[PDB]
Paper text:
Although DNA has to our knowledge not been reported as an AUF target, we had previously discovered that certain metal-based compounds can form site-specific adducts on the histone proteins that package DNA into the basic repeating unit of chromatin, the nucleosome. We therefore investigated this as a possibility for AUF targeting here and found that AUF and RAPTA-T both form histone protein adducts in the nucleosome core, albeit at distantly related sites. Moreover, the presence of RAPTA-T substantially facilitates AUF adduct formation. This synergism elicited by RAPTA-T and AUF appears to be mediated via an allosteric mechanism within the nucleosome, which has biological implications and may open up new avenues for drug development beyond metal-based drugs.
Numbering used by the authors:
A (entry chain H), E (entry chain D): 28 to 122
B (entry chain G), F (entry chain C): 14 to 119
C (entry chain B): 21 to 102
D (entry chain A), H (entry chain E): 38 to 134
G (entry chain F): 16 to 102
DNA sequence: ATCAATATCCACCTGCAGATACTACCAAAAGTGTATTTGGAAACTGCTCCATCAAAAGGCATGTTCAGCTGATTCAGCTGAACATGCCTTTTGATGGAGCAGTTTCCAAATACACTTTTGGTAGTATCTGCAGGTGGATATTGAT
DNA sequence: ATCAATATCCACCTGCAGATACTACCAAAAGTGTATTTGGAAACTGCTCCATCAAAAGGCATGTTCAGCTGAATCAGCTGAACATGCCTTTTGATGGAGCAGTTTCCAAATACACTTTTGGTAGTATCTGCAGGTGGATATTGAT
């Protein structure tokens, strides 16, 4: 009865942009969902730690950014950082 | 009403991400951009894997992505492999690979 | 035909795993060794999973119990929740 | 009257099994072994079906990968036959010993 | 001249308790101080997660307890569990 | 006028441990037994290591425990060695240990 | 500040004898001549990984000085926790 | 004219160095190396001296442990001489690759 | 070489397990407008300790010499691979009931706030002591013979 | 065995670094007490989904045979250890300021609370289809000769 949340539909939206004729098994989706939750935790976890090291009460994008740098490998980190700074720009300017 | 995701141009739920961050005891407080940033990054990474896993599907003459396609995607890319190097993908098997000294002689 | 359960993990099953692992030729003593190793693995993981179960005041080990045990053992698994 | 040379089938199986992803241990024996082991920690236990599965997935992944390292250790010693010492060396270096 | 706290006097008390004619070098104390902070962080973390997994907002001595069984090895865990139980029992009855 | 430490029969500081639990954002709420139980465990472990470290000091005819003695203590005890198996003690050195085959003759 | 000396090839300060000492502490009796270059490589990788993270912490804090704490936190992320320097 | 047989000083040194705890790499060289690598990531950086010490303690600890593992790999190969292949096998198995 | 036994390849077909599609639905997030609380850059400046210079302590570089290790060669013998299938264990599916999970309740315990006290840190200036590093002097280890 | 070159182990000493000490003091603690909020245990209960088991499926225990691997024995070539030797580089101790880190003001930003709108999970019933699993026949691979 209790509603069981998931990233599955967002994963699915993104699947279509990337491969509009391609589908995905249940098992595969479950894996993708673990993946998102994992990376979520890793990044938030590091960010938390950063704030604490620096006696700050807040997790701001700067923390998520540094977190991403520390966790992601070279090229992945760079792109992710750009996608990240991008989305925040776009969001600020939008009314 | 217009979703923060659509404002940020994202398929991934800025709202949910924001929430999950608060109810995560990650810190006392949570700036407004952090979930946007975070959500972008997750979207991004999701795309990359889905891209490569699709390509993997293609190679094997398939249109439905299965675990095996996620495994082949991840372990054939140096960077994904490293990020997921202490992770096990259920039902992924392994990359075909045989040590050359084990091959029969010509 | 009285027999320990560890021995249910048979020569041919162990041989298959090795094969997936790229192994061509296998000493006969491997099978006992491998069972020993598997038993330590399961102990360590199961111990931790059950500890989760007991904490949740349950009598059923859930897949999330196992998943969380694997994560803290450094063996994160994807596809069974979390 | 036709026989295959030692190691031809071995190679054949490597290729076969590297290609598939099925679990290679029979479900039931494994399930018992799991339950037996859990019994020493708490009695009257029940197991979700997916919990046993998760344990199997993980164990087989674990063991497959240990055979990779093991095999590298045999090759290091200029062999092609895995032996318990190779398993031991791998576990020691991994920090399991 | 900001006040830097440590567990040093407590480590010293306990030291006296067990080896009354023995001193400890400041580097040794530093390591001792690191060790306590470390184990604190590691128990508190396990506790944290455990609560979350069980949709609890509160960390009780029951959470700490499981964290200890999860984190420590066999015999250290058995005995650490005594001493904590003992201390709580004795804490409850002392008011 | 009594501290919670003395109330619980402890040298280690319960107030402090309470305080550090709140500000570390481990959960919304912190129960009253938690800092008691934890401070106890902390004290138990630090006692166990000091006992063993003290003996190493005495086995070397020294009165002041230094890092080498901490290291000898931890590495000589199976369970402390595992608990600290991924930790490095500055100035601790290693355990004397030469592999058999390396020694002279046969 | 006037002038700032150029750092190059310092990996070679990790001398043959110093590497031999570490092998000894590590219980090694005999050392092939190729070990020293290999070891220099391995050390260089180890340091790069730790220093990158350490410096990342430094910058995130908006500092110009790398603290013992930056290194300690870096070491912890990388599964090589160090006691003795404030953590 | 007098001589120890090869191996005798070597074991002498093992006992010596396993008994002590001093850093075995000279301070300044190691300092320069740190400063160099850092500079290559970021210019105009300073280091607390304990930060360099922390790195040195970590580095030597890392390297001494790597040589035990390396040594075990040689011995597995029925040698007593460590070679780069031993270091490499250690690091592969350790998951450093 | 050739010859044949068997494994592997590709194409085409087909039923259904497992995918996508769908609408009600409703409930629970997420977003919208109003009032409150709080955090942390900027501006300023004390002051720790980092960078950077000269003199003294000893470890490094280099060439020579040959001990003994490594790695090639060979080879006997042992040990694991391959093999056929009836036989016994696992798999598949059928069915009660444990328990997990949903819900509501109410109180013991936790948060909040406000004096009140205690204590853990430092700082200033003093005062004590374990032991590291020097000496010489007696015993072990090692290697030539 | 014997001799002897060299390392190692004591023991005893002595300066002094760094440790234990103590008296003044204080700000930030922890403690105490009273008011108000609520989390989670506790208790009933509904419905999955888990253990059990009968019937249907099919993988493996068996022992025999021998190819080919592992490991012992042997040996030459040469790498790496030991050591003597000349001196360069690091170590140790004593003097300038970049930048860290500690105080304070102030608004830009996040919290809170309540409200109003939609989205996303489920379930309902049905809707749809990619592909695993089977066929047939052409060709590759392996092994015997
Ligand atoms: Mg440079």
């Amino acid at each position: 009865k209790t509603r069981k949340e998931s990233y599955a539909i967002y994963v699915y939206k993104v699947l279509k942009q990337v491969h509009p004729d391609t589908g995905i098994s249940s098992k595969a989706m479950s894996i993708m969902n673990s993946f998102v939750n994992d990376v979520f935790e890793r990044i938030a976890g590091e960010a938390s730690r950063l704030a604490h090291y620096n006696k700050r009460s807040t997790i701001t994008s700067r923390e998520i950014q540094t977190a991403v740098r520390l966790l992601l490998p070279g090229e992945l980190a760079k792109h992710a950082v750009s996608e990240g700074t991008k989305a925040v720009t776009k969001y600020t300017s939008a009314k | 009403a217009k979703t923060r995701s659509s404002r940020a141009g994202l398929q991934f739920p800025v709202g949910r991400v924001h929430r999950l961050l608060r109810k995560g005891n990650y810190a006392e407080r949570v700036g407004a951009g952090a979930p946007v940033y975070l959500a972008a990054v997750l979207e991004y990474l999701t795309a990359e894997i889905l891209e490569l896993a699709g390509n993997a599907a293609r190679d094997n003459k398939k249109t439905r992505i299965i675990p095996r396609h996620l495994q082949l995607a991840v372990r054939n890319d140096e960077e994904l492999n490293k990020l997921l190097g202490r992770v096990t993908i259920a039902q992924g098997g392994v990359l075909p690979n045989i040590q050359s000294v084990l091959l029969p002689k010509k | 035909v009285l027999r320990d359960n560890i021995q249910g993990i048979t020569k041919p099953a162990i041989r298959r795993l090795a094969r997936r692992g790229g192994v061509k030729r296998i000493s006969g003593l491997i099978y006992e060794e491998t069972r020993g190793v598997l038993k330590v693995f399961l102990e360590n993981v199961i111990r931790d999973a059950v500890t989760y179960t007991e904490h949740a005041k349950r009598k059923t080990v859930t897949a999330m119990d196992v998943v969380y045990a694997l994560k803290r053992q450094g063996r994160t698994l994807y596809g069974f929740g979390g | 009257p036709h026989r295959y040379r030692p190691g031809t089938v071995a190679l054949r199986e490597i290729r076969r099994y590297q290609k598939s992803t099925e679990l290679l241990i029979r479900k039931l024996p494994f399930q018992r072994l799991v339950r037996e082991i859990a019994q020493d920690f708490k009695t009257d236990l029940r197991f979700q079906s997916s919990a046993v599965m998760a344990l199997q997935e993980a164990s087989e992944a674990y063991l497959v990968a240990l055979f990779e390292d093991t095999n590298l250790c045999a090759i290091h010693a200029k062999r092609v036959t895995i032996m318990p010492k190779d398993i031991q060396l791998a576990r020691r270096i991994r920090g399991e010993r």
